[PDB]
Amino acid sequence: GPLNMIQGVLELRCRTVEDVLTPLEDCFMLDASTVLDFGVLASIMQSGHTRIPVYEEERSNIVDMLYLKDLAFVDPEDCTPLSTITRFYNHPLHFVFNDTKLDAVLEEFKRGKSHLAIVQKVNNEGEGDPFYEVLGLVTLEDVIEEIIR
Protein backbone atom coordinates (compact mmCIF):
# COMPACT_ATOMS: atom_id res chain seq x y z
CA GLY A 1 0.00 0.00 0.00
CA PRO A 2 2.20 2.85 1.34
CA LEU A 3 5.19 0.94 -0.07
CA ASN A 4 3.65 0.98 -3.55
CA MET A 5 2.88 4.67 -3.01
CA ILE A 6 6.51 5.49 -2.15
CA GLN A 7 7.60 3.69 -5.33
CA GLY A 8 4.97 5.79 -7.15
CA VAL A 9 6.71 9.06 -6.21
CA LEU A 10 10.09 7.49 -7.04
CA GLU A 11 8.69 6.55 -10.47
CA LEU A 12 7.81 10.23 -11.02
CA ARG A 13 11.33 11.14 -12.22
CA CYS A 14 11.71 8.35 -14.81
CA ARG A 15 8.11 7.92 -15.99
CA THR A 16 7.16 10.36 -18.74
CA VAL A 17 3.94 12.16 -19.64
CA GLU A 18 3.74 9.83 -22.69
CA ASP A 19 3.49 6.77 -20.39
CA VAL A 20 0.41 8.02 -18.63
CA LEU A 21 -1.55 10.22 -21.07
CA THR A 22 -4.99 9.59 -22.50
CA PRO A 23 -4.87 9.46 -26.33
CA LEU A 24 -7.02 12.04 -28.03
CA GLU A 25 -9.81 9.75 -29.27
CA ASP A 26 -10.55 8.60 -25.70
CA CYS A 27 -10.69 12.15 -24.29
CA PHE A 28 -13.83 14.14 -23.49
CA MET A 29 -13.68 16.94 -26.03
CA LEU A 30 -16.11 19.59 -27.25
CA ASP A 31 -16.39 21.14 -30.71
CA ALA A 32 -16.34 24.95 -30.85
CA SER A 33 -19.55 24.95 -32.91
CA THR A 34 -21.22 22.79 -30.30
CA VAL A 35 -24.21 24.68 -28.91
CA LEU A 36 -24.85 24.58 -25.14
CA ASP A 37 -28.43 23.29 -25.07
CA PHE A 38 -29.88 21.18 -22.22
CA GLY A 39 -28.50 17.98 -23.80
CA VAL A 40 -24.95 19.30 -24.24
CA LEU A 41 -24.86 20.98 -20.81
CA ALA A 42 -26.02 17.77 -19.08
CA SER A 43 -23.35 15.86 -21.03
CA ILE A 44 -20.79 18.28 -19.56
CA MET A 45 -22.29 17.81 -16.07
CA GLN A 46 -22.28 14.00 -16.42
CA SER A 47 -18.73 13.82 -17.82
CA GLY A 48 -17.00 14.31 -14.46
CA HIS A 49 -14.51 16.73 -15.98
CA THR A 50 -14.25 20.30 -14.68
CA ARG A 51 -11.79 21.23 -17.45
CA ILE A 52 -12.75 20.27 -21.01
CA PRO A 53 -10.78 20.84 -24.27
CA VAL A 54 -12.47 22.82 -27.04
CA TYR A 55 -11.45 22.08 -30.64
CA GLU A 56 -12.11 23.54 -34.09
CA GLU A 57 -12.72 21.14 -37.02
CA GLU A 58 -10.34 18.33 -35.99
CA ARG A 59 -9.77 17.08 -32.43
CA SER A 60 -5.98 17.57 -32.64
CA ASN A 61 -6.61 21.30 -33.14
CA ILE A 62 -7.35 22.39 -29.56
CA VAL A 63 -8.25 26.08 -29.37
CA ASP A 64 -9.53 26.85 -25.86
CA MET A 65 -10.57 25.10 -22.66
CA LEU A 66 -14.01 25.16 -21.07
CA TYR A 67 -14.01 25.40 -17.28
CA LEU A 68 -17.21 24.63 -15.33
CA LYS A 69 -17.25 28.12 -13.79
CA ASP A 70 -17.66 29.42 -17.36
CA LEU A 71 -21.13 27.86 -17.48
CA ALA A 72 -22.32 30.21 -14.77
CA PHE A 73 -25.17 32.21 -16.31
CA VAL A 74 -25.80 30.31 -19.52
CA ASP A 75 -29.46 29.94 -20.18
CA PRO A 76 -29.53 26.50 -21.86
CA GLU A 77 -32.81 27.50 -23.53
CA ASP A 78 -31.57 30.46 -25.60
CA CYS A 79 -28.97 28.58 -27.36
CA THR A 80 -25.45 29.85 -26.69
CA PRO A 81 -22.72 28.22 -28.80
CA LEU A 82 -19.52 27.18 -27.00
CA SER A 83 -17.28 29.42 -29.10
CA THR A 84 -18.79 32.62 -27.67
CA ILE A 85 -18.45 31.33 -24.09
CA THR A 86 -14.77 30.53 -24.74
CA ARG A 87 -14.45 34.17 -25.86
CA PHE A 88 -15.88 35.32 -22.50
CA TYR A 89 -12.99 33.89 -20.46
CA ASN A 90 -9.22 33.62 -20.78
CA HIS A 91 -8.15 30.09 -19.90
CA PRO A 92 -4.55 29.76 -21.15
CA LEU A 93 -3.60 26.46 -22.78
CA HIS A 94 -1.03 24.23 -21.07
CA PHE A 95 1.17 22.40 -23.58
CA VAL A 96 3.67 19.74 -22.53
CA PHE A 97 6.25 17.70 -24.46
CA ASN A 98 5.93 13.90 -24.47
CA ASP A 99 9.35 13.28 -22.89
CA THR A 100 8.63 15.44 -19.82
CA LYS A 101 9.08 13.51 -16.56
CA LEU A 102 6.11 13.39 -14.23
CA ASP A 103 7.66 15.38 -11.37
CA ALA A 104 8.31 18.28 -13.77
CA VAL A 105 4.64 18.26 -14.84
CA LEU A 106 3.45 17.84 -11.24
CA GLU A 107 5.42 20.98 -10.35
CA GLU A 108 4.05 22.65 -13.51
CA PHE A 109 0.51 22.01 -12.24
CA LYS A 110 1.64 23.42 -8.87
CA ARG A 111 3.15 26.55 -10.46
CA GLY A 112 -0.32 27.68 -11.57
CA LYS A 113 -0.58 26.27 -15.10
CA SER A 114 -3.69 24.41 -16.24
CA HIS A 115 -4.51 21.11 -14.54
CA LEU A 116 -5.20 19.80 -17.99
CA ALA A 117 -1.91 19.49 -19.82
CA ILE A 118 -2.01 18.63 -23.52
CA VAL A 119 0.73 16.43 -24.95
CA GLN A 120 2.85 17.02 -28.06
CA LYS A 121 5.86 15.33 -29.63
CA VAL A 122 8.22 16.49 -32.38
CA ASN A 123 7.41 14.87 -35.73
CA ASN A 124 10.25 14.37 -38.22
CA GLU A 125 8.90 11.33 -40.05
CA GLY A 126 7.06 12.45 -43.14
CA GLU A 127 8.33 14.74 -45.80
CA GLY A 128 7.24 18.22 -44.67
CA ASP A 129 8.46 20.62 -42.01
CA PRO A 130 8.67 19.26 -38.46
CA PHE A 131 5.47 19.91 -36.52
CA TYR A 132 4.28 19.35 -32.96
CA GLU A 133 1.96 16.33 -32.98
CA VAL A 134 -0.91 16.17 -30.49
CA LEU A 135 -0.87 12.77 -28.77
CA GLY A 136 -3.45 13.46 -26.18
CA LEU A 137 -3.98 14.78 -22.65
CA VAL A 138 -2.57 14.31 -19.16
CA THR A 139 -4.07 15.80 -15.98
CA LEU A 140 -3.11 16.52 -12.38
CA GLU A 141 -5.57 13.68 -11.65
CA ASP A 142 -3.60 11.33 -13.94
CA VAL A 143 -0.33 12.07 -12.11
CA ILE A 144 -1.89 11.65 -8.65
CA GLU A 145 -3.16 8.22 -9.77
CA GLU A 146 0.48 7.23 -10.42
CA ILE A 147 1.15 7.72 -6.69
CA ILE A 148 -2.09 6.42 -5.19
CA ARG A 149 -2.10 3.30 -7.20
Binding site: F97, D129, P130, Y132
Partner: protein, 156 residues
Protein backbone atom coordinates in the same frame (compact mmCIF):
# COMPACT_ATOMS: atom_id res chain seq x y z
CA UNK B 1 -2.29 27.41 -31.22
CA UNK B 2 0.44 25.03 -30.04
CA UNK B 3 2.62 27.11 -32.31
CA UNK B 4 5.61 28.20 -30.23
CA UNK B 5 6.37 31.81 -29.25
CA UNK B 6 8.48 34.24 -31.31
CA UNK B 7 12.15 33.44 -30.68
CA UNK B 8 14.76 36.19 -30.73
CA UNK B 9 18.06 35.08 -32.21
CA UNK B 10 20.84 37.67 -32.06
CA UNK B 11 24.36 36.89 -33.29
CA UNK B 12 27.19 39.23 -34.38
CA UNK B 13 25.18 42.47 -34.03
CA UNK B 14 22.30 41.27 -36.17
CA UNK B 15 18.90 40.08 -34.98
CA UNK B 16 16.27 37.55 -36.05
CA UNK B 17 12.76 36.51 -35.10
CA UNK B 18 11.49 33.02 -35.84
CA UNK B 19 7.69 33.06 -35.65
CA UNK B 20 4.58 31.08 -36.63
CA UNK B 21 1.93 31.70 -39.23
CA UNK B 22 -0.92 33.76 -37.75
CA UNK B 23 -4.50 33.84 -38.92
CA UNK B 24 -6.29 37.15 -39.57
CA UNK B 25 -8.30 36.39 -36.41
CA UNK B 26 -5.05 36.38 -34.40
CA UNK B 27 -3.23 38.91 -36.42
CA UNK B 28 -2.88 42.11 -34.38
CA UNK B 29 -1.25 40.31 -31.44
CA UNK B 30 1.19 38.90 -34.02
CA UNK B 31 1.90 42.43 -35.30
CA UNK B 32 2.20 43.65 -31.70
CA UNK B 33 4.74 40.84 -31.19
CA UNK B 34 6.80 42.07 -34.14
CA UNK B 35 7.09 45.74 -33.14
CA UNK B 36 7.76 44.80 -29.51
CA UNK B 37 10.77 42.95 -30.91
CA UNK B 38 11.28 45.85 -33.34
CA UNK B 39 11.31 44.07 -36.69
CA UNK B 40 11.46 46.09 -39.91
CA UNK B 41 11.00 43.00 -42.03
CA UNK B 42 8.88 39.85 -42.40
CA UNK B 43 9.63 36.91 -44.68
CA UNK B 44 6.79 34.50 -45.35
CA UNK B 45 8.27 31.20 -46.55
CA UNK B 46 4.98 29.33 -46.46
CA UNK B 47 1.81 30.11 -48.44
CA UNK B 48 -0.35 33.10 -47.46
CA UNK B 49 -3.10 32.62 -44.89
CA UNK B 50 -3.41 36.26 -43.93
CA UNK B 51 -3.65 39.76 -45.39
CA UNK B 52 -0.15 41.28 -45.28
CA UNK B 53 -1.48 44.83 -45.48
CA UNK B 54 -2.40 45.41 -41.79
CA UNK B 55 1.19 44.32 -41.02
CA UNK B 56 2.51 46.49 -43.88
CA UNK B 57 0.57 49.56 -42.69
CA UNK B 58 2.34 49.17 -39.33
CA UNK B 59 5.48 49.73 -41.41
CA UNK B 60 6.96 46.25 -41.67
CA UNK B 61 8.25 45.15 -45.09
CA UNK B 62 6.48 41.84 -45.76
CA UNK B 63 7.97 39.47 -48.34
CA UNK B 64 6.34 36.33 -49.75
CA UNK B 65 9.06 33.82 -50.63
CA UNK B 66 7.34 30.41 -50.47
CA UNK B 67 9.14 27.19 -51.19
CA UNK B 68 8.29 23.52 -50.71
CA UNK B 69 7.19 22.11 -47.35
CA UNK B 70 10.33 20.63 -45.78
CA UNK B 71 12.68 21.55 -48.63
CA UNK B 72 16.08 23.19 -48.59
CA UNK B 73 15.90 26.81 -49.78
CA UNK B 74 16.23 26.90 -53.59
CA UNK B 75 19.15 28.96 -54.76
CA UNK B 76 17.22 32.13 -55.65
CA UNK B 77 15.53 32.31 -52.24
CA UNK B 78 18.79 32.08 -50.25
CA UNK B 79 20.41 34.51 -52.74
CA UNK B 80 17.66 37.10 -52.17
CA UNK B 81 17.64 36.35 -48.43
CA UNK B 82 21.30 37.32 -47.93
CA UNK B 83 20.87 40.40 -50.14
CA UNK B 84 17.81 41.38 -48.07
CA UNK B 85 19.77 41.16 -44.81
CA UNK B 86 22.49 43.44 -46.21
CA UNK B 87 19.95 46.07 -47.33
CA UNK B 88 17.90 45.92 -44.12
CA UNK B 89 20.79 46.14 -41.64
CA UNK B 90 21.87 49.02 -43.80
CA UNK B 91 18.36 50.38 -43.25
CA UNK B 92 18.14 50.10 -39.50
CA UNK B 93 21.25 48.94 -37.61
CA UNK B 94 20.05 46.52 -34.92
CA UNK B 95 16.58 45.97 -36.24
CA UNK B 96 15.21 42.42 -36.40
CA UNK B 97 14.17 40.32 -39.40
CA UNK B 98 11.15 38.06 -38.90
CA UNK B 99 10.79 34.77 -40.73
CA UNK B 100 7.84 32.41 -40.50
CA UNK B 101 6.73 29.18 -41.98
CA UNK B 102 3.81 27.29 -40.48
CA UNK B 103 5.14 27.21 -37.12
CA UNK B 104 8.75 28.32 -37.26
CA UNK B 105 10.05 24.85 -37.18
CA UNK B 106 11.27 24.11 -40.59
CA UNK B 107 12.19 26.37 -43.47
CA UNK B 108 12.20 29.66 -41.55
CA UNK B 109 14.88 28.35 -39.10
CA UNK B 110 16.97 27.15 -42.08
CA UNK B 111 17.20 30.69 -43.48
CA UNK B 112 18.23 32.00 -40.04
CA UNK B 113 20.70 29.13 -39.46
CA UNK B 114 22.27 29.59 -42.90
CA UNK B 115 22.63 33.32 -42.15
CA UNK B 116 24.45 32.42 -38.91
CA UNK B 117 26.84 30.11 -40.81
CA UNK B 118 27.52 32.82 -43.41
CA UNK B 119 28.30 35.24 -40.56
CA UNK B 120 30.69 32.60 -39.20
CA UNK B 121 29.00 30.44 -36.78
CA UNK B 122 30.11 26.85 -37.23
CA UNK B 123 27.21 24.74 -38.45
CA UNK B 124 26.69 22.41 -35.46
CA UNK B 125 26.61 25.40 -33.09
CA UNK B 126 24.08 27.18 -35.33
CA UNK B 127 21.67 24.21 -35.25
CA UNK B 128 22.00 23.71 -31.47
CA UNK B 129 21.49 27.44 -30.81
CA UNK B 130 18.14 27.37 -32.64
CA UNK B 131 17.14 23.94 -31.31
CA UNK B 132 17.90 25.09 -27.75
CA UNK B 133 15.09 27.68 -27.83
CA UNK B 134 12.97 26.17 -30.59
CA UNK B 135 12.60 22.46 -29.97
CA UNK B 136 12.83 19.91 -32.79
CA UNK B 137 13.48 22.53 -35.39
CA UNK B 138 15.01 21.14 -38.59
CA UNK B 139 14.21 17.93 -40.49
CA UNK B 140 16.51 15.38 -42.15
CA UNK B 141 16.83 17.15 -45.53
CA UNK B 142 17.40 20.61 -44.05
CA UNK B 143 20.02 19.36 -41.60
CA UNK B 144 21.79 17.76 -44.59
CA UNK B 145 21.50 21.02 -46.54
CA UNK B 146 22.99 22.90 -43.57
CA UNK B 147 25.82 20.36 -43.29
CA UNK B 148 26.69 20.49 -47.00
CA UNK B 149 26.36 24.29 -47.12
CA UNK B 150 29.58 26.27 -47.52
CA UNK B 151 29.89 30.01 -46.79
CA UNK B 152 31.99 32.40 -48.72
CA UNK B 153 31.07 34.84 -45.94
CA UNK B 154 28.86 37.28 -47.86
CA UNK B 155 27.52 39.55 -45.14
CA UNK B 156 29.52 42.73 -44.71
Amino acid sequence: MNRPAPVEISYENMRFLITHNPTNATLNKFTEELKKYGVTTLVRVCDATYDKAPVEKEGIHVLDWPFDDGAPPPNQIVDDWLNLLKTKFREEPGAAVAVHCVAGLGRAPVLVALALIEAGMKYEDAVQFIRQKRRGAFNSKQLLYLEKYRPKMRLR
